[PDB]
């Protein structure tokens, strides 16, 4: 009995031993020069062979071999495009990828294998994909659901997917009429992903969509605290907590593993105030398909 759009999903049509080979159509930097680190939005052609649904992931196998002459292991990317895709024909797939660069123990700079291969792709290059993967982040079946989305960085991906479906497409069997609420936590104004798309949706469905940004390094609360995602939510605690109390409210969280803790910290307090144990409540929410998380 799912509350999510699980019926007829496709999973692992394509596997690492037998990946689908698509081609890169577009690759754009989506962050400003200021921004700490780059995020790219890239679109691949799949000719309709990968029948994915909003909320799913695909695996990518970066070209080359590991230190043992074996092919690289796949990396997971949550799909950033809705099922029809950015061109609305259901034959392309889009990714939101942050370029990973670090320094090892010896002070040597290291590039992440898969993120660099991807961010480097040129239109026309081929790419090996697997999947689609996932059920965890599927959308609720209920077109009148209250949908709360908390993403950090690249974690915006699945929410972009949902939103496109909700507000930029006409579907024969789906018409969103609830309230969607997005909170996006980024470090800088130059790291605000797809804001322009979101501003157009806001205009379009002003009573159905709520939008809040948290730019850590540029925003503070009254206390003078950094504007983290929880820091921004805290400002709506009464509301959100009230929202959590209703059966038709679904929470989705995506992004950096770190985010989980600070939200649980806020939650723990709100609930206790009311005589509720957050740890148990959450578990029930999870069981009810109301508290959905994918962080990494
Ligand atoms: C379910 C899921 C969804 C994801 N969705 C996306 C997405 O939508 N967008 C996206 O960009 N990523 C996403 N990721 C992350 C992505 O899968 C890759 O792991 C990421 O792009 C880096 O892989 P790479 O091959 O570039 O790095 P690799 O070459 O594999 O380097 C990985 C290793 O880097 C090391 N490392 C990282 N930072 C440091 C540091 N500061 N110091 C020392 N060591 C360090 C760690 O040991 C780590 O295991 C997702 C991951 C998962 C599991």
Swiss-Prot record:
Membrane topology: Peripheral membrane protein
Gene Ontology biological process terms, A to Z: electron transport chain; photosynthesis
Cofactor: FAD
Keywords, alphabetical: Chloroplast, Electron transport, FAD, Flavoprotein, Membrane, NADP, Oxidoreductase, Photosynthesis, Plastid, Thylakoid, Transit peptide, Transport
Binding site for FAD: 75-78, 96-98, 102, 113-115, 154
Catalytic activity reported: 2 reduced [2Fe-2S]-[ferredoxin] + NADP(+) + H(+) = 2 oxidized [2Fe-2S]-[ferredoxin] + NADPH
Whole sequence portion shown: 74 to 369 of 369
Originating organism: Spinacia oleracea (Spinach)
Role played: May play a key role in regulating the relative amounts of cyclic and non-cyclic electron flow to meet the demands of the plant for ATP and reducing power.
Remarks, miscellaneous: FNR is probably attached to the membrane by a specific binding protein.
Stated name of the protein: Ferredoxin--NADP reductase, chloroplastic
Enzyme Commission code: 1.18.1.2
Subcellular location: Plastid, Chloroplast stroma; Plastid, Chloroplast thylakoid membrane
Entry similarity comment: Belongs to the ferredoxin--NADP reductase type 1 family.
EC primary class: oxidoreductase
């Amino acid at each position: 009995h799912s509350k999510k759009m699980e019926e007829g999903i496709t999973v692992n049509k394509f596997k690492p031993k037998t990946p689908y080979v698509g081609r890169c159509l577009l690759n754009t930097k989506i962050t400003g020069d200021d921004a700490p680190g780059e995020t790219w939005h890239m679109v691949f052609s799949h000719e309709g062979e990968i029948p994915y649904r909003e909320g799913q992931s695909v695996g990518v196998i970066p070209d080359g071999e590991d230190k043992n002459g074996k092919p690289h292991k796949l990396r997971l990317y949550v799909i950033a495009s809705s099922a029809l895709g950015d061109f609305g024909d259901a034959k392309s797939v889009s990714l939101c990828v942050k370029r990973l660069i670090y320094t090892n123990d010896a002070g040597e700079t290291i590039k992440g294998v898969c993120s660099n291969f991807l961010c480097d792709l040129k239109p026309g290059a081929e790419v090996k994909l697997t999947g689609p993967v996932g059920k965890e982040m599927l959308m609720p079946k209920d077109p009148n659901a209250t949908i709360i989305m908390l993403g950090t960085g690249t974690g915006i991906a699945p929410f972009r997917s949902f939103l496109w479906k909700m507000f930029f497409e006409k579907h024969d069997d789906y018409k969103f009429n609830g309230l969607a609420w997005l909170f996006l936590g980024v470090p800088t104004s130059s790291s605000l992903l797809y804001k322009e798309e979101f501003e157009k949706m806001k205009e379009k469905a002003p009573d159905n969509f709520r939008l809040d940004f948290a730019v850590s390094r540029e925003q503070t609360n009254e206390k003078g605290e950094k504007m983290y995602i929880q820091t921004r939510m805290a400002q709506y605690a009464v509301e959100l907590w009230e929202m959590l109390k209703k059966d038709n409210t679904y929470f989705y969280m995506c992004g950096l593993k770190g985010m989980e803790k600070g939200i649980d910290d806020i939650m723990v307090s709100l609930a206790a105030a009311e005589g509720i144990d957050w740890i148990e409540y959450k578990r029930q929410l999870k069981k009810a398909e109301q508290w959905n998380v994918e962080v990494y």
